[PDB]
Design a protein around this ligand. Sequence first.
Ligand SMILES: Nc1nc2c(ncn2[C@@H]2O[C@H](COP(=O)(O)OP(=O)(O)O)[C@@H](O)[C@H]2O)c(=O)[nH]1
Ligand SMILES: Nc1nc2c(ncn2[C@@H]2O[C@H](COP(=O)(O)OP(=O)(O)O)[C@@H](O)[C@H]2O)c(=O)[nH]1
Ligand code: ALF
Ligand code: ALF
Ligand SMILES: [Mg+2]
Ligand SMILES: [Mg+2]
Ligand code: NA
Ligand code: NA
Lengths: 336, 333
Amino acid sequence: EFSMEDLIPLVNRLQDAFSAIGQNADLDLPQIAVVGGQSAGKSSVLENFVGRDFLPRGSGIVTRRPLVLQLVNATTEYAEFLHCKGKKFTDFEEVRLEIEAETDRVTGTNKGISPVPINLRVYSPHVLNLTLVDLPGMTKVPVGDQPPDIEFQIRDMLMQFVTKENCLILAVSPANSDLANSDALKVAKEVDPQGQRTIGVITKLDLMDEGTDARDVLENKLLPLRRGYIGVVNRSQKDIDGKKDITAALAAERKFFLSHPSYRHLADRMGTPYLQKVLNQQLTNHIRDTLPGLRNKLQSQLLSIEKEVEEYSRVDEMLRMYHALKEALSIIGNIN
Amino acid sequence: EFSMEDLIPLVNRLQDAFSADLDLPQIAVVGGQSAGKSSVLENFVGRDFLPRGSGIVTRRPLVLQLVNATTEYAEFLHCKGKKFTDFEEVRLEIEAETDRVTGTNKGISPVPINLRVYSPHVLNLTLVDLPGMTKVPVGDQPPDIEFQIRDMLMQFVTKENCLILAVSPANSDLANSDALKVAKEVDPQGQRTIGVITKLDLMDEGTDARDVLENKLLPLRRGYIGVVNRSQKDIDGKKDITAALAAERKFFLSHPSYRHLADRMGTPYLQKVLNQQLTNHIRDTLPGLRNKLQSQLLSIEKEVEEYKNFSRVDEMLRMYHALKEALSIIGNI
Ligand SMILES: Nc1nc2c(ncn2[C@@H]2O[C@H](COP(=O)(O)OP(=O)(O)O)[C@@H](O)[C@H]2O)c(=O)[nH]1
Ligand SMILES: Nc1nc2c(ncn2[C@@H]2O[C@H](COP(=O)(O)OP(=O)(O)O)[C@@H](O)[C@H]2O)c(=O)[nH]1
Ligand code: ALF
Ligand code: ALF
Ligand SMILES: [Mg+2]
Ligand SMILES: [Mg+2]
Ligand code: NA
Ligand code: NA
């Protein structure tokens, strides 16, 4: 009867301890990271997991730092950032502003990026028990005052997440561009050739040119993926501006698939609700099969933290990682 | 007084004789797959002869020589002696010839298809249609298709007299532009890169490309020109060029973010600018062209000098005469 719930007690502690001191890139915990070109609609897809407006979204470069989003099912609903402990947020608009402010603090407002992640934990009776990673979208040419190698700084940042064995890759591609043009799929095939942990998501289906559709892609025929593709339709910029809510966006999406002559026959396997259901199941299957591997990785990190203790505030930080790992090992050893 | 018309007697003689080493003036399109490149080039003629569509369509370079003339017809260097009057047959030939040399359903070939179109409504210049860049192979395409396509483009855009039409679709952030990335690589100073923004009619409600079109997001010396070409539905319905141009004109005049730029937007404006830029570009580098020709003449002269017996020989002589004639012509301009 294994589920993500069983991992919650250990994931929670480990994330605090490691990400707190900039070592987030050490743990190989189960998570789902979003990859794709700039403005493909990645943050819009992730935001739906919470059901509230809280992630900065928009055309042009908006997400500029990774966001490690820990979702925990709980009776009450509130959010907390690792960078400002003690402060609990109930207003999701204020959560959005803090992500924007924390991003600007480090990356400025002249379009730069930073691989330092913002860690946010959200407790809600409506969410699944998953960790999502929002990431800046891949680009080809620098604009404004971005550095000349911005494309590679962005790729490097994403690679650090997606090369991990327990990271499910959500390869996001916009319907209004040929799939052959997909930066998400190129990246995904490079790190996960067999497609064992890659899921395709086609966004912006409502923006396709008249007389065309993505049926061949959605039926998994154009470029087959082991895990298939799921189509979604999120809010346009006009919608965001006009304050259309998620409940209304979801209804428009359901109607879109049921009434589109190219997709009606696939409607049951399309949409945001379906994507979230499938992602949860896929992550559950992945970790169920890789639990021994996770235990062995934590055993390795523990061996590593021990050696580091003897080499020596920084002591407190290391001890917190040490105890979280010891506890994680005990908890995981009891999971079947 | 100098105009592309002055080069017609020269360019045609040379092209015919040479069958690269010739750096003749031309305009090449670069961009991601299905950015709208072939659709842009087709407007230079207006006879639905270029295969267009979503998915990979253009799969071989097409070197298209346009010549203003009283009669309208076309010739393919590979179909010697046959003059095409039916443009649908022309479109079908491009398709068949593409299948012939690529030898695959979706792969490409860098061997160009040479086509010349005579028409009373065309400018006098050469356009090069090219497959769009991709990232992942589909169907029977080779695993390195991305690099085979980039290599193919490079064959044209590294040339000194090749103007680069960097085509980027408006429905994708400019920062994602394969076109501008390649243009910057082969032409850092932008002396020969002209930006074209297609699919302006497809942008998400609530957004616009004003900063791109005002040359502020990623400035180019030559600027950016926005166009609105026919959709796939329109193509399938055979919408004519006249209707497409009127809808384009209406789009810019009615869009609140672009109306103030209307006099420098659109297909007619793009073609005027392209012609002028190509004319200026070659007018200023004419002595350079002359030397390029002269070096090939002097070279071939020595070899042809000892010719005195008795179709490689015939081909060599034709190049000699063509080069010798071109030299005289250019010398008078
Ligand atoms: N019409 C439409 N617009 C969308 C869709 N998904 C996202 N957008 C818009 O695309 C832009 C980019 O969204 P964002 O989620 O910030 O993408 P990200 O940069 O890749 O995280 C915003 O202006 C969204 O309103 C979609 O399915 N349909
Ligand atoms: N709505 C719209 N569709 C366009 C526009 N330009 C091209 N298209 C469509 O985009 C697709 C690609 O056109 P094509 O010229 O073949 O691009 P190429 O592959 O880059 O040569 C076709 O389905 C065209 O109908 C445009 O400005 N607006
Ligand atoms: F704002 Al982005 F990829 F363009 F998150
Ligand atoms: F058909 Al293309 F670039 F996709 F010419
Ligand atoms: Mg984002
Ligand atoms: Mg084409
Ligand atoms: Na964006
Ligand atoms: Na195409």
